[PDB]
Design a protein around this ligand. Structure first.
Ligand code: IJU
Length: 129
């Protein structure tokens, strides 16, 4: 896209170790699946396009961007070594929203709804087998 947006987070790297775990399978089949189809998921299904949204300071403030499109690709392409890495990506996505936006802004209410679902699902993350 635009040269004024950064490249997205890495979703491919042969030098990085990778594994399938039952927890990562749950993150794809249960967690990502549940959040992706939520009424409020759409702003989080791709990187923030700061050019299109006229947010020229976005990537001045948000230096660790993350979105569910990136996470989806990381899960489908087995990028992760463990669940913690993926959980951290979800948390980064939520916290970016809370840092950039005003409390009670629509995008924050949307993020908070997804995070509440997220937490419910992560509380049932299975024991690693
Ligand atoms: C104006 O809101 C900035 C913003 C937009 C999106 Br899409 C996600 C997070 N933060």
């Amino acid at each position: 896209g635009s040269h004024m947006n950064p490249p997205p987070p890495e979703t491919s790297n042969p030098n990085k170790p990778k594994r399938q775990t039952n927890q990562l399978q749950y993150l794809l089949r249960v967690v990502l699946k549940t959040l992706w189809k939520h009424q409020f998921a759409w702003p989080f299904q791709q990187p923030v396009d700061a050019v299109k949204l006229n947010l020229p300071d976005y990537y001045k403030i948000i230096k660790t961007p993350m979105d569910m499109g990136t996470i989806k690709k990381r899960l489908e392409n087995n990028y992760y070594w463990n669940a913690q890495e993926c959980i951290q990506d979800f948390n980064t996505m939520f916290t970016n929203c809370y840092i950039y936006n005003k409390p009670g802004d629509d995008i924050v209410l949307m993020a908070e709804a997804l995070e509440k679902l997220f937490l419910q699902k992560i509380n049932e993350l299975p024991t690693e087998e």
